[PDB]
Design an enzyme around this catalytic site. Sequence first.
Site, PDB file in Angstrom:
ATOM      1  CG  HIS A 206       1.126   3.319   4.264  1.00  0.00           C
ATOM      2  ND1 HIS A 206       0.632   4.186   5.178  1.00  0.00           N
ATOM      3  CD2 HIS A 206       0.420   3.510   3.131  1.00  0.00           C
ATOM      4  CE1 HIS A 206      -0.384   4.838   4.646  1.00  0.00           C
ATOM      5  NE2 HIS A 206      -0.523   4.453   3.382  1.00  0.00           N
TER       6      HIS A 206
ATOM      7  CB  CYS B 108       8.507   7.597   8.747  1.00  0.00           C
ATOM      8  SG  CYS B 108       9.655   8.222   7.491  1.00  0.00           S
TER       9      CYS B 108
ATOM     10  CG  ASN C 235      -1.717  -1.264   1.388  1.00  0.00           C
ATOM     11  OD1 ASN C 235      -1.574  -1.924   2.422  1.00  0.00           O
ATOM     12  ND2 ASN C 235      -2.487  -1.665   0.391  1.00  0.00           N
TER      13      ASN C 235
END
Lengths: 265, 264
Positions: B188, B223, B186
Site C-alpha cells: 500500500h 491512492c 503490504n
Amino acid sequence: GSLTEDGLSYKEKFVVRSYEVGSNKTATVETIANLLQEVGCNHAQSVGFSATTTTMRKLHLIWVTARMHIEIYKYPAWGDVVEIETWCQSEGRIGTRRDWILKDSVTGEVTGRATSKWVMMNQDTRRLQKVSDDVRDEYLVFCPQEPRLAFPEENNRSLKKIPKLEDPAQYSMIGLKPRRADLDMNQHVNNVTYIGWVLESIPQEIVDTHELQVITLDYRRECQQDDVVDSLTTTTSNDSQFLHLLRLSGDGQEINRGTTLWRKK
Amino acid sequence: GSLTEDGLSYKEKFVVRSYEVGSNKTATVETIANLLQEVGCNHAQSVGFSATTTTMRKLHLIWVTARMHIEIYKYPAWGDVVEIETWCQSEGRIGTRRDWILKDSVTGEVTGRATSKWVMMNQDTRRLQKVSDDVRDEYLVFCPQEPRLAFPEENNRSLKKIPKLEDPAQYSMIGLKPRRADLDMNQHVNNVTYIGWVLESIPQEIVDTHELQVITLDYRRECQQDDVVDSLTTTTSDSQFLHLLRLSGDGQEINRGTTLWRKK
Ligand SMILES: Fc1ccc(-c2ccn[nH]2)nc1
Ligand SMILES: Fc1ccc(-c2ccn[nH]2)nc1
Ligand SMILES: Fc1ccc(-c2ccn[nH]2)nc1
Ligand SMILES: Fc1ccc(-c2ccn[nH]2)nc1
Ligand SMILES: Fc1ccc(-c2ccn[nH]2)nc1
Ligand SMILES: Fc1ccc(-c2ccn[nH]2)nc1
C-alpha cells in the site's frame, strides 16, 4: 559508528526499520544503498572532511559517483542489526574507490558487498579533472596502502563495460519526476533515487518471484529537479538478467545505464 | 527502544541521518513522520500486537489513519539524537488516538508533538465499523486510564474541521505517482508519501524562506499503486495554506490539509 583500531576503515550498526522493508519483510536494495551512503558520510565526518578537502573547496571541486556495484546474498529482516564496514582507496589520477562489506551482527556472516568509482568534477562547469598530487596526498593517510578489495576477483562482475539498450525496450516506466524527498541537502537528486527509477521498469512478477542479487549502475548526467525520466529494461538472459537505461523523457539524453541479476526465490 | 517504567508508553532514540535532512541540514517533516511511524510499530511490537488483535485478524479488521496532526518547534540537525515517546488512548466506539512527544535528547526540551485519529476498517470491503467492547478491553490494559494528551487545549488546532479547496487552486503539482520505495510491506502507499505530495504544491520560495510549524492532514481514500495524484494549494492568509490531493482523472478526493509556516 567508529573508525576501526587502525583508523583506515569505519564500522556502523543499523537496526532495520518498519518502513525500510518490502513484501519479503526484508530491506529493499534502496534501504541498503541509503545505509551505504550514511556510513560513507559518517566515515568522511570522522576524519574531518565535508567528502572534499580545503584545496578542493578552494577550487570548487566535488567527488561524484561514476559507478555503483552492489551484491546482496541475504537482505536483513525488519528489526535485524546489520553491520557495515567501509574504506576508500586511490585509483591514481582517474579517481578513487569506496568499498563496503555488510554483515549479520548476530552471526558475523557476510550478507552483501558493494564498491563505487568516484571522479573529481568542477561543481559549476561540470568538467571532469584528473586528481592532482596535492589532493592525492591529502586522502592517502586515510586509506590502506596495500590493496583491500570488496571484489578482489582480478576480473569480476563490477568491472564490465555496460552496453546501450536499443529501442524498442521490452519494458518501460514513463514520466518519472523527483519530489522534495528525493533531493539531498544541496537540492540535487540523491544517487539512490536513480536506483529506484531503474527498478521501476522491472515487471511486478519478477519482483514477486525473484530477489535482486547484483546491480551495477553507471551515472552519466544528473536529473535536474525539473527534468522528467523514462526508465527502460530488456531481458538479456533460473537466473534472470536485464539491461537498463534512464534517459530524459524529452530529448532522450542518457542519465544512467545498468544491469541487474535476479535469482528465483 | 523500551516501554517506560509503567508499561503504558514507549521511548526510542534516533540519530538523524545524512539523507534524512533538507536544505537547512535539519530533518524533513517526512523524516519526522517516518520516525513517528517506526516508534509506533515498535510500541505495538513490544506488547504482542501484529497493530491488530488476533480477534481483529479473524474479522479481517485493521486500524487506518483518519487524521495526522504534527507541530514542530525545532527540526533536529544531522547527527543530533531525538527522543520520541508514544502512547495510545480509546476515544470509545469512534476509534483510538496515538500521541507522540519529540525531545532533544541532550537538553530534554520538547522540540515537537503529534497526534493521530485511527478508525477500524474491514481490509476487504473497506467499510468503517465502530469498535466492539471485546476489541477495546484487549487494548485498554496497554493504554493510560487518566487522559494524557499531547494537545490538551480543549478545542485546539488538531480538532478543527478542514474545508474543501475550491477550483481554481492558487498552486498545483499534477501527475504525481508512487514508486516501489513509496509502498509498505503490504504494497500500500505509505501514509508519509501523502504528506510529501501535499507539500509538493507549496512554492519553492516559501520552502526557502519559511519553516513548516503545523500540518493537519485528513485521509479520505487510498491512492492505489497505479493511481495518479494532483496536489492543490491556496494561501488562506506567518503563512497558512489549504491543501487538497485528488485522483488526476475523475478528481476523487484522497486527502485535505492545512499547513502553518513561520518566516526563518
Ligand atoms: F548507492 C550509493 C551508495 C553510497 C552513496 C554515497 C556515499 C557517500 N555519498 N553517497 N551513494 C549512492
Ligand atoms: F571517492 C569518494 C568516495 C567516497 C566519497 C564520499 C562522499 C561522502 N562520503 N564519502 N567521496 C568520494
Ligand atoms: F575520495 C575520498 C573521499 C573520502 C575519503 C575518506 C573519508 C574518510 N576516510 N577517507 N577518502 C577518499
Ligand atoms: F505521520 C504518520 C504516518 C503514519 C504513522 C503510523 C504509525 C503506525 N503506523 N503508521 N505515524 C505517523
Ligand atoms: F489506534 C492506533 C494506534 C496505533 C496504531 C499502530 C499501527 C502500527 N503501529 N501502531 N494503530 C492504531
Ligand atoms: F488501537 C491501538 C493500537 C495499538 C495500541 C498499542 C500498541 C502498544 N500499546 N498499545 N493501542 C491501541
